[PDB]
Amino acid sequence: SELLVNTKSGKVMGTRVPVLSSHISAFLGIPFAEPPVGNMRFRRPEPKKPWSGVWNASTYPNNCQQYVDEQFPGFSGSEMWNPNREMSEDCLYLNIWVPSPRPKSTTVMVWIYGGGFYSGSSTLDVYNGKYLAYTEEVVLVSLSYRVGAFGFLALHGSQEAPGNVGLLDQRMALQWVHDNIQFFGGDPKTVTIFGESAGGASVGMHILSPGSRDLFRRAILQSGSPNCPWASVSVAEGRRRAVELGRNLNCNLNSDEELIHCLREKKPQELIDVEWNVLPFDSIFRFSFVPVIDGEFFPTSLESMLNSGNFKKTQILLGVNKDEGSFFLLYGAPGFSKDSESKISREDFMSGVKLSVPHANDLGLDAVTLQYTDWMDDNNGIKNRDGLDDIVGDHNVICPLMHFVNKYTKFGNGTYLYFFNHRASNLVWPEWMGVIHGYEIEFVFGLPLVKELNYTAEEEALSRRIMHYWATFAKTGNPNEPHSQESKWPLFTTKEQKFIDLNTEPMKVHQRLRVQMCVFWNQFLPKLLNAT
Amino acid sequence: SELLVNTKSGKVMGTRVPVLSSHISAFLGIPFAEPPVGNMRFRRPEPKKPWSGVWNASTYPNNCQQYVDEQFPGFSGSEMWNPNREMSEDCLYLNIWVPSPRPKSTTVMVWIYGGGFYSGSSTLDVYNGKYLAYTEEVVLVSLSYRVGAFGFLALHGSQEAPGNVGLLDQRMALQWVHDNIQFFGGDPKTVTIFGESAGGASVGMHILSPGSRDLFRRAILQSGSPNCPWASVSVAEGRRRAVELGRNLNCNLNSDEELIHCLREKKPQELIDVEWNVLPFDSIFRFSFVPVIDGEFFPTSLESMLNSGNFKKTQILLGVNKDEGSFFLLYGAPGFSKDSESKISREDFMSGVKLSVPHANDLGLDAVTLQYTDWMDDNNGIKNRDGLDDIVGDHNVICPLMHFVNKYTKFGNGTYLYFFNHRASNLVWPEWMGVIHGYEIEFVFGLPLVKELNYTAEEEALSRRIMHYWATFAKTGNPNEPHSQESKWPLFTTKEQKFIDLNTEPMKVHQRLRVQMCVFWNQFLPKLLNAT
């Protein structure tokens, strides 16, 4: 049967799902690890013991335990990102969409969800792999991984809570795809990993980690890169936050053993209730438990790895959105509101700068403020709002990504860079937020092909274009069809630094994406902070 | 007789000079001090002993001893600024142009020449007062003062070489005008002092100095202000340079008495031969012997005087030119040449930055470089050339002046601000130098009214406009004619910060002159340097 697949771990039974007036096979909730529950909380994942019988893979699995966004109850803009399945520590599963009839050996794409390493679900409507698998005839995988303290609590030196175990969750799913996707018609030698935000940083982290490089062919990173200021902490900061967490829960803090045992006795929501209290600064775009620079998953610092070429050399496709910052200002900066234009007073602007660069001294705040203030019109509330927007996105997403892309292209085998700046016509968020963090995903997964979702015909064309860029890149290492008459997406090179816009207008090619601000964020400001 | 005038110091006999197919009276080379020669070198000026008989005031006096520009022999662009009279330490004289017939009690304007406190002459063709005196019916005075070491060698604590004596030369000329201009038909209660560059800084310094405030009514500063980074040094730096000077001349350095006596034995050219060797940095737009913050002429620091309102409160007219920096880059920065377009390589740009901010550390140089580099086009040699031009003018002229004008307007009684950006049609300097430091003077003194000098009719109109703005301001404290139908020059206020362009086009009003760069030069960079 087409819905029955024999794997090295056992048989699985999928389900036939409709898609665009056709059908494909879906294998939902396949386990790839032992449930990381009980005494295994905070530990590295173990591989799933093979099973007898037929595993029912007809339904979506549980989502991992996470903080849940209640800032706008009933509002689809925020709740479409919340878990849409019961939460459970028993959450290490993956999902596969397979073209029908079953392919023999086809291109594989593995989706890694974002969410600041504190949240995320493989089961969201916007991650439904059936449109991409059907349209582009790829085998689409989405994995899952522990977030929050459950995935990233780091007590370096301990083997019970070493840190990075959510990254190892991802790697074990990658190992499982490598070992088993051939049975689903996937080609294990042509696996592209792709992800957005924390998932894009994750993709970059598997590019860097020697233990991960061999498990995939090429990589796509959307609005995230491994060197992002929020994506990792040192071993000392990870230890400090773990101890502060136990301090929030009245834990014996005498030893790692005491602390871990206390934290393992707590119910999941107890950890989530206090998770945000361990941040060291009054900040935005900073998350409590994230990957740790441990000398094991990451052999040395990220910057020295990037400088020495210590990373997998292959092709990469990556990009950013126009207004990456607006989401985080909405949720955490004074003066921003969902239902107003959020014109920003000068006081509020200064408050925003401080939340945005929480590690900066007062001279650093001044440097940032000078760089982003039109002093001919300092009380322009729209310029203050857009200026804060740019600060948050430049510092947290665009300029770290530009630093990564420039270090990587020196040693890599091909780079394609995009600037996604289409505001969707059916967007439920306010105008001022612009082209929001995460809102290219629905185009990458082909949601505008579904008529009931109220996109324009031009947006369907843009989605089909992006889906084909991405799958063609996954298949060949080049998003362009050979001998095609459509406009070509030029390679990004050290010399020319070309990129394209992604929108409903005819493709335009630019160079040196936001280079003025990224020189400030990547060269000048770190020098200023290190000297003062 | 109209050419004979009885003053408190004695009688003087002027000469009738032609001007624009008419005639006026000129009284040239009137002494206002004792010759500061011999044992008086470096000392405060003494007042001139009154004389018997009639002083022959028919000819221009000697110019003070100064370094002479030989960088372009025979080239009128540079030599029109050189002394055009024999040099002598016997040089403390002033010149008066008087309308004919002699007025009874008219507006007086006193010109103070520029030249970095190391050079300058009252006798230059471009300072000929006859056009302004004739056209606007003012009594035009030009004074002189010691420059170089002769005017500004500073051994604080010594009464033989206290410093600032060139400023006291200026003040004694002002005292003489106050005491005697009534006899020439001048009104001593309506004296405007005006000057360019070091002379504009000089004007600002008499505004600040309590010993000078009472000797004039109002003030005009052109491309110079008292707080300029080159216009003054501390008492310790003045002492260091004085000692280094004696070290260059094999002087006994055991005591101030030893040092001063040695320096007084030297011929003037011996001092001039080594004057440039005492600068502490590899710099441009820095001069060896300048005013010193002595606690006497200047009671406290300039910044605290400006903050507390400790200065004469009156009306001021001031402005800058578009390309103040190009002169100094031509003479001292690598890659700039009189006869090429001076397109500037990146290496040369970096060299220029270091010469321009010689007191900056490497982080400060980076801040400057970032502020003035278009990183989308970093190898644009024209952008590097114009960028260096702007750095030099912003840092040395425009932004210090903007700092002065903003501090002053808080306490003053009326400010008028101009941006002079007309390139003269007969300019002999290359195109790349633009609207050069000092090249508004010829318009202020009415040279375009002389047909043989090859200006356009529009330039004659601009000169007449500027002459009338200036004389009307000198007469009333407002450059605008009351109940006039011509376009009005708005007051500069703390709130609106309006200024005008001065060129051959219809007047345009702008606000916040070069405010973006001046926030960098006046707020951020000093903070950066003081913290690092």
Ligand SMILES: O/N=C/c1nc(CCCCCN2CCOCC2)ccc1O
């Ligand atoms: O990948 N997306 C993650 C993402 N994260 C945010 C930050 C929301 C964090 C809210 C934290 N608060 C802190 C105080 O306690 C309650 C929760 C905002 C937009 C985003 O897209």
Ligand SMILES: O/N=C/c1nc(CCCCCN2CCOCC2)ccc1O
């Ligand atoms: O007020 N004008 C003064 C002014 N000053 C300069 C600087 C020229 C200084 C040349 C100094 N050098 C230094 C080395 O020895 C020879 C002389 C350039 C343009 C100007 O307008």
Ligand SMILES: *[C@@H]1O[C@H](CO)[C@@H](O)[C@H](O)[C@H]1NC(C)=O
């Ligand atoms: C698999 O699970 C679904 C939902 O729980 C159920 O409808 C279906 O019959 C199951 N298939 C089996 C048990 O073979």
Ligand SMILES: *[C@@H]1O[C@H](CO)[C@@H](O)[C@H](O)[C@H]1NC(C)=O
């Ligand atoms: C990738 O590597 C191959 C050799 O393995 C080389 O021929 C090709 O030019 C490389 N492409 C890029 C874009 O570096």
Ligand SMILES: *[C@@H]1O[C@H](CO)[C@@H](O)[C@H](O)[C@H]1NC(C)=O
């Ligand atoms: C004044 O000096 C000039 C030039 O030296 C001379 O021509 C003139 O006759 C003199 N007048 C006198 C001495 O009365």
Ligand SMILES: *[C@@H]1O[C@H](CO)[C@@H](O)[C@H](O)[C@H]1NC(C)=O
């Ligand atoms: C100048 O001072 C007078 C009072 O002496 C005042 O009435 C006038 O408004 C002032 N002008 C300005 C521009 O401050």
